[PDB]
Ligand binder design. Structure first.
Ligand SMILES: C=C[C@@H]1C[C@]1(NC(=O)[C@@H]1C[C@@H]2CN1C(=O)[C@H](C(C)(C)C)NC(=O)O[C@@H]1C[C@H]1CCCCCc1nc3ccc(OC)cc3nc1O2)C(=O)NS(=O)(=O)C1CC1
Ligand SMILES: [Zn+2]
Length: 197
């Protein structure tokens, strides 16, 4: 019981840059470094942007900042802390029934704003910065306009689904697939984010 360990913190290893001409993923911490920043929690690298790429010692996914909170998904993060300059940081929101968790948006970062103009055709940002047209077919669901394998959507949970203007409509959570070809998607409607707040 003395020779016991603890599940390290979630570490920011990069970001999906969207603030210019094109969308592209940037790496900020290697694998050997992330394996350490998760064991300590002391993350010195400053934060920029809205969509961050996060990793645990065994998995990797995304996290989106909205209304001043860095949201992600529970099945990737769990109750883990996040590495901040001032050590680990406890989540200020945890709802397993929704598969949702959140930390205070670190400084130096920007937080999207919920879309209030009614989203019709959404755009899903993937782990590899790809922007995939989604046709909102529900309140938390959206069919894909172009079919592609599930393998290109794995590790994208916690990412954003965006208005044509760029506001946030939800948080990619699960995928609807048949025969290995993803046909639709589901997300956490940003209104439920507000309700949790
Ligand atoms: C392909 C990419 C896809 C975005 C990803 N999401 C998933 O794979 C989720 C995880 C799990 C199964 N998922 C699915 O998408 C399934 C699957 C058949 C597997 C495609 N699809 C599906 O159900 O269709 C039905 C409409 C949905 C409604 C019913 C499902 C409800 C969703 C859900 N809620 C909870 C609450 C609490 C929990 O505690 C442990 C756990 C949960 N797990 C869940 O779904 C992803 O990349 N993750 S990740 O980044 O690689 C990860 C390593 C970090
Ligand atoms: Zn909008």
């Amino acid at each position: 019981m003395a020779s016991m360990k603890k599940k390290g913190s979630v570490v920011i290893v990069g970001r999906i840059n969207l603030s210019g001409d094109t969308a592209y993923a940037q790496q900020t911490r290697g694998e050997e470094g992330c394996q350490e920043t998760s064991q300590t929690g002391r993350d010195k690298n400053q934060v920029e942007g809205e969509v961050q790429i996060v990793s645990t010692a065994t998995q990797t996914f995304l996290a989106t900042s909205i209304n001043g909170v860095l949201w992600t998904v529970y099945h990737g993060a769990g109750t883990r802390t996040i590495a901040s300059p001032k050590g680990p940081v406890t989540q200020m929101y945890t709802n397993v029934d929704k598969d949702l968790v959140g930390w205070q948006a670190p400084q130096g970062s920007r937080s999207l704003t919920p879309c209030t103009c009614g989203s019709s055709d959404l755009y899903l940002v993937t782990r590899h910065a790809d922007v995939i047209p989604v046709r909102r077919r529900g309140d938390s669901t959206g069919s894909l306009l172009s079919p592609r394998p599930l393998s290109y959507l794995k590790g994208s949970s916690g990412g954003p689904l965006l208005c044509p203007a760029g506001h946030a409509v939800g948080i990619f959570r699960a995928a609807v697939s048949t025969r290995g070809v993803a046909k639709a998607v589901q997300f956490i409607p940003v209104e439920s984010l507000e309700t949790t707040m």
